[PDB]
Amino acid sequence: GPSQPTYPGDDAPVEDLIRFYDNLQQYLNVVTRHRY
Amino acid sequence: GPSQPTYPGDDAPVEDLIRFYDNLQQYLNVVTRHRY
Numbered sequence A, B: 001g002p003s004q005p006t007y008p009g010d011d012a013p014v015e016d017l018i019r020f021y022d023n024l025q026q027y028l029n030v031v032t033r034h035r036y
Helices: A014-032 B014-032
Strands: none
Touching: A014 B014
16 A cells, blocks of 8 residues: 555665565556556 | 665655656665575
8 A cells, every 4th residue: 555665774785675676666657547 | 777766755855756756766776686
């Protein structure tokens, strides 16, 4: 659902950043409902 | 370039989250070079 994605940190490795990217993808998909 | 994207905050509005999404898109595009 509209789960607020957790931010690992600034020094987070690119893999976890990919994770955050996908988690933001899901979150944004939900909250924006593709209105951007 | 590989500019480390700035994190606005947890309560950041979805627009700025879109911004961070695109900034992460650029950053990840660079650093991963599409290897994910």
